[PDB]
């Protein structure tokens, strides 16, 4: 296949994938301006991305699962704490970045994580919007920190569920594996406090990693003590504001079986509400990543479950 | 059609005939206690196979026979957590299903039905010592149940509902029966005094005004932690006839209570219900276990086991 | 005390048989009013299942099955043209409450008499003809005993089954599920047995076989049979043709709710082949062994056996 | 506001199409670079499932189909010796973002015509052939309508359904995914029609059947007509011939991820003996109503429906 | 370094003596029983780790031989033998590969094993051998155990949806991919006659021709129904060995197996062509069932019992 | 009718190749454990796939082969929570699987077999410094592990039973080596000092007079908040030979782990088991992980991975 064909189709392509988001964010904002009381909303982007996963791929089919999930006929459009998702400042959809359509024209991994970076800037620059990603593996966190931290110019504090720290310097030598988004977050200089819960799978190698960036790793086998600590949270304050990353598998997997990693002795669900519903601070975005439809069980449950924590970080976010 | 005189005439007749079924299951039940002495009260099952008032699903209507089967299932004794023998027909026993699915299809409307559901407990509250112990189907039942125990015992309850919803919506999509009104309909006819809601998580900012207006005491999630010392020492029924337990099973956790129709994350453990449960103090006048969907379930059945054992718990306290 | 436990007996059975009286009463008096009808299929579940071997699940498959005759994603029309939404065309009556019953302390005879006089109460309605919803298998025995007494003579039998159902001692329960037709034969209530799906029999039952002249249809012999029960002719010269299908007759790809699986088995089109080209008086007939609690999580043989019971309807129905 | 809410519905819609077209344009200029091709069957997912009648997850399919074709269990030749790798053989497009359209509050008529239209994008790049990704049955009407317009003159179907998808009126909804070939029949898109598979069809549909000379199959003949039906030629005189593949031909066995299961269909040997004989000029073709909701654990129908897909492109290219 | 591989033997030299006191007694027991020519035995290869894509026909040798002998389900074969008798099937035992490999042995080695293995069961008169696998990548050292123990080449039976012929699959030699190129590399059969293809590659269609296989696909079935339901093998050579790999039968019928693949033979196919079958069997495997692929009611280790149950009545005499 | 001379001679020579393979396995690992230095103790995992004193389903029997395979599952890394390197042989060793089926196919009876049990287990002992780690197999093999442990040792142990069931009942069924009766057969033997019983909530009147027959210490559910301070915080072992860890895999709440044959609801977290068992202080000398139920597990094999990291993280206490 000749150079010039895949140089220019490349460009075109993307430029064409763009536009679609772009004109998707334009319609959202003027819709929310139109509308006026309201100073933030929480707009879904979807990141259709698995082939950073290490062991399955599923999650790249997630987005559209958990937005109908969303408004699934079992449920009602009130959060917990009384928002109604029904009011389109509450939560809004985007689009999705079509991933699979730009790799398949030949685009690298350095040039699709921009485009993901690129999506997300142009969320960010329709007031009020503000971006709500939903993964895709945890690879995304990294392009996605990147742009919300270069759009905002400056650090943000980091709320991170996982039962995996994620802080890999080098894992099986991809640079964009999602078991290193983190690494690549503290290396860029993008976070200030990084605040991991549900930790419970963690090498010594990455415990050095942990101790060299400063992060605040919480594990479960210390929940009990560091409860009033989590459930007391007040961040942001100083930097640009407050990112919350959520990976489905900090789930204990009789919660959520759907995810490519199951790591027995998890968070409850009520555990990531309590710290979600306490948090204090100005939060400037967030995602909730690795829910794997081929993995869920036959009634969807943890679709439920990632909608559910969409629509409470929503309620979160949105002002 | 067919002439609306014969459709009348088979209601009528297929309506009675049904009631004295449960009448003469009834009758047999009571004198079989009173032969055997030392009983005050007997958790009788009475089986309500309705799910069309429901909302999403209406597979609870199979409920009440799986849970009967799980209550004596293989990999289970018979001892309850306290000590009580499921064996003694004192402690509990079946006095049958009323059938649903053939009075509706004699084109019974749902009043109709919801008279011959209330009747159906009052044939077992007439044997003494049977106290009815209701197996749903959907929660529309509660109303009819909890105002033929009312109307019989000419006097109000205090009711613990177990629950993810506060099923206290004024009109759901203009179905005075729903499954998410019962309490509203239970509480305009004042036949509860207090109602102890425990397990909510689901509830819009209409039915809010709702639990105000009628002084309804709604325990949410959110604050069970806070909430946990009172409902652990739960006190009812005292000044008015006796106390009701409603328990809905998708008040429980989806994770340990898959087989419901409405999964609501973030619920109830399993050891919460029997912790308030256990140590509940008041006269126990009648109860309720719904929701329960077969349909839904595992392939190993581990909700009619959750559900099995939420009854046989209920009535290690009802019966006496 | 035993004066105390006849009574409650008597009384509980005879509310039952009213029950069932009194709804066969109006659907008879329906169709009756409606005219332009010789048979109407009219439903009586048996939810009976501690007489089986492996698993009593079958119980609880009457009212599933009812239902997924009018899932949503279906229409009411069968596949050769009957609609199902004509009351004329099936209809349903009840449940016989054996939980109910059973725990009165009633003996399997019985048992089995109340089913028998249940089947009756529905043959006494013109025009009803009793299609009976298992349960499991040891039913078809008081089934085919009231319809073969109530009709004054024997029928021929076509039925579909993994296992001939021939034992004529299986495990010391008369009433097994493994053993009904040999009950049936035993007492002259059918002429010809035309078995179909079989691919488990043991030799002792091929003994069975010989002696009442039935005729079993294996399953490795299926190709060579197929222009046979393609165009089966039963009933001639006797009183009529029952028809008990087994769900377990169908390979378990198909129907993984039953309590046996047999390897091997009949394809759900090689059913409804013999089927829709059976000729001959369908006086009754029954579709037993469904097994809710071994089903998928989609029900797919509650589909399964609400399209048995349809496409049977449809062929006694007239 | 109409007028604004309008302008940014076609602002919305306009990138949508501007993006296929650059994918369609990038794989038409590979095709043609490589050189010695005539046809390359082109993959054009239509993620809409807001017109079925039961359940709406064969929304989801047409990213699950794809990942199936090269599923690491598998190898990537055709059973009659073609290789997948050349892009020559089979290529993707893109999906039409239907979600995202419809959230703009686009309206059903012109939700069709956009599918028209990404439908004639592809057609526009030679040497591709649309071979589209549903998504339920709906979309083979605004699919069959581009590709006939585009050429000019009606084509000849091969349908396989359980279901005739022919109903005048299906529940008020005009876009009904079971009156798709109602609409094509109408609009004189389609010669001929032959479908094969149908195993649920009402009496009102055997009289839609009769008006437009419909060739309908049903199962319960299909021993029968298998020497037709694994010889046919169609097409001639015509612009071509069409392939609509619908999932739940198959038997629910084979094919549990659809939301119509219908007991009794389709081996998929069945469709491999006429689709791998079928004579003919093939101009598109669709495979329709996988629904991963409902596939199990293991994913067989989301192979299923990408072996069919796989079989298909190894007839359209050439 | 030469410590090491002397700790080896004596961990295979054990594994090896297990079977053999095993063999030892299931052949005393048919010789004092009399009237017994043959007797399948059962000998399970628990060999998942040549799978390209699933591993779990690993763990379906202890599956198979519990659903032979089973609850609700008689025993008796399709056309009369009694599965009670010894004398028509009876269980040897496991090779340990999962000890064996995590000794360090390599896959040259462990492949010795499993061929002396198979030869300790055909030392002991009279047994054959009838292998559970395990993927398919074990009937090239059963094969070659067979052959070489007789003496010669046999005919060769083989269901399958894959050639199994790949030269050179993903660079590992003993991939599962690969048994069948193996076998005929090492000359230890004559005619390989392969029943239910339907995926197949350019290059192994040139395998192939150039072996002259006689390979069936599915979409000639019909029309080879005649030939392949009179099947005579081994006429001249030392006999006949039948290998059935369980994704040969659609997987709506075999959904316990690791390669779905769409379009299979009916459980009727197998059978038709394996009783009408005429030639002396010396051995047989049925391989790739996939226990955690199965359903929850494990309806394939029924499918592959019943496999292993007629094959057995045609081993057995 | 088949020569008993002939199955004797079977008997004794496939029982005396199954205990050399044990033998030469756990040689193999424990001179690999000498030469490389710095270990005092090295869980070795010895199969016991035994099914067949189970009282309601016999899968258990295959679950051995799976534990280890989920030990080293694609999906996880080799590192404990704790910190300890799971690739170090010196941490966690296989020595292999007892061959239960092929010795039952010779005939042998039920005592004879737990014997071979038992010098399989004090074949892994001889090897300093390997440590015994049984995967089952149903419960019924703590009875000869056990009895093995403490007979190598010459004295009693203490034990951290973990469990929805006491298992001391004093005759199952008939059957002497029943699963529900390895801790009756243990008292009587007298080879446990203290038994204290994690996560109980089924048990029977009988059985309850056996706790207090023998001075067990049976935790309920029904009290696990009241305990917590004590069972996080174990001391045991002082004055005895040491500690063993048996845990039952139904000790778990069923939401965690279906792959078991009795389910009983309102069970343990498993973080609950991993609180007692990293807090655990004393000489820990055997354990075992027993009732997972590859047959009832989900297809996704969660309770396979449920099991090992049971036996990942008891390995990790017993190592150093
Ligand atoms: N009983 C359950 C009612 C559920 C309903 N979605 C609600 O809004 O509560
Ligand atoms: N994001 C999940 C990474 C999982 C990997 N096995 C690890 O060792 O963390
Ligand atoms: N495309 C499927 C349509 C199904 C519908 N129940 C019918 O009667 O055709
Ligand atoms: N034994 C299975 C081999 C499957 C392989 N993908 C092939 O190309 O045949
Ligand atoms: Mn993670
Ligand atoms: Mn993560
Ligand atoms: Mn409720
Ligand atoms: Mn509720
Ligand atoms: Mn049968
Ligand atoms: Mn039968
Ligand atoms: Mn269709
Ligand atoms: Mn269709
Ligand atoms: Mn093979
Ligand atoms: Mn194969
Ligand atoms: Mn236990
Ligand atoms: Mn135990």
């Not at 959202?28 to 082939?51: C, F, Q």
């Not at 991170?160 to 991809?174: I, K, R, S, T, V």
């Not at 988004?181 to 406090?193: L, V």
Request: some cysteine.
């Amino acid at each position: 296949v000749s150079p010039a064909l895949l140089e220019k189709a490349q460009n075109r392509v993307i430029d064409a994938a763009l536009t679609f988001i772009r004109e998707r964010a334009k319609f959202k904002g003027e819709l929310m301006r139109s509308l006026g009381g309201v100073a933030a909303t929480s707009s879904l982007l979807g990141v259709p991305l698995g082939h950073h996963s290490s062991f399955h791929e599923g999650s790249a089919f997630a987005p559209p699962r958990i937005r109908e999930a969303i408004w699934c006929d079992s449920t009602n459009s009130t959060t917990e704490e009384g928002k109604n998702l029904r009011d389109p400042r509450v939560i809004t959809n985007v689009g999705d970045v079509p991933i699979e359509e730009i790799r398949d024209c030949g685009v690298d991994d350095k040039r699709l994580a921009n485009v993901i970076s690129e999506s997300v800037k142009l969320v960010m620059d329709e007031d009020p919007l503000r971006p709500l990603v939903l993964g895709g593996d945890h690879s995304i966190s990294f392009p996605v920190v990147r742009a919300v931290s270069e759009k905002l110019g400056g650090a943000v504090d980091i709320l991170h569920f996982d039962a995996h720290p994620d802080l890999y310097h080098d894992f099986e030598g991809n640079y964009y594996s999602h078991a290193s988004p983190f690494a690549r977050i503290m290396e860029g200089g993008y976070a200030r406090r990084l605040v991991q819960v549900g930790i419970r799978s963690i090498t010594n190698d990455v415990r050095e990693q942990v101790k060299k960036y400063g992060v605040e790793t919480h594990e479960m086998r210390t929940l009990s003590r560091d409860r009033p600590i989590l459930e007391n949270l007040k961040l942001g304050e100083g930097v640009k504001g407050v990112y919350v990353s959520i990976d489905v598998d900090s789930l204990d997997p009789s919660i959520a079986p759907g995810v490519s990693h199951h790591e027995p002795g998890g968070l409850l669900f009520r555990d990531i509400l309590n710290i979600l519903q306490n948090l204090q601070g100005d939060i400037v975005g967030g995602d909730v990543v690795e829910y794997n439809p081929q993995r869920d069980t036959y009634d969807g449950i943890t679709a439920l479950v990632a909608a559910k924590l969409v629509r409470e970080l929503a309620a979160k976010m949105s002002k």
